[PDB]
Amino acid sequence: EEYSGIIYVSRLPHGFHEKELSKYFAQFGDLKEVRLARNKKTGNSRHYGFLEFVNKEDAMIAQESMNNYLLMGHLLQVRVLPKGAKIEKLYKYKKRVLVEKGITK
């Protein structure tokens, strides 16, 4: 009851973008949305993103499997976000703001 179907994903390795997010995470259930954080001017990846699953059960399973998955010298971090999370709103925050709000912990 207390969690959304949305995950925050970070410590992405070089070359790991929206297509790789989809490829790795769609294996756990159908996806409603995949977003990679990018500098709005240069287009450069900020090396984290947000995904939403159609079934929030699947978000829990993806988080359990992909959190601390070691890929290309990176330990992927995955967090299921509490109820009320909305990618449309969270995607707008500066990275340091997500960190201050405790969303990335």
Residue ranges in contact with Cl ion by CB under 5 A: 74, 77
| Residue with Cβ nearer Cl ion (38 or 74) | 74
CA pair distance 85, 47, nearest whole angstrom: 20
Q: Where are the alpha helices (DSSP H) in 1-105?
A: 18-25, 56-66, 87-90, 95-100
| Residue with Cβ nearer Cl ion (54 or 75) | 75
Spatial contact of 103 and 91, defined as CB atoms under 8 Å apart: no
In the complex, what is the shortest distance from the CB of residue 18 to Cl ion, in angstroms, rounded to a whole number?
17
The half-sphere exposure of 98 on its side-chain side, counting CA atoms within 13 A, is 23
In the complex, what is the shortest distance from the CB of residue 37 to Cl ion, in angstroms, rounded to a whole number?
11
In the complex, what is the shortest distance from the CB of residue 47 to Cl ion, in angstroms, rounded to a whole number?
5
Report CA Rg, the chain.
13
In the complex, what is the shortest distance from the CB of residue 1 to Cl ion, in angstroms, rounded to a whole number?
26
| Residue with Cβ nearer Cl ion (63 or 77) | 77
| Residue with Cβ nearer Cl ion (47 or 56) | 47
What are the structure tokens assigned to 63, written together? 């988080």
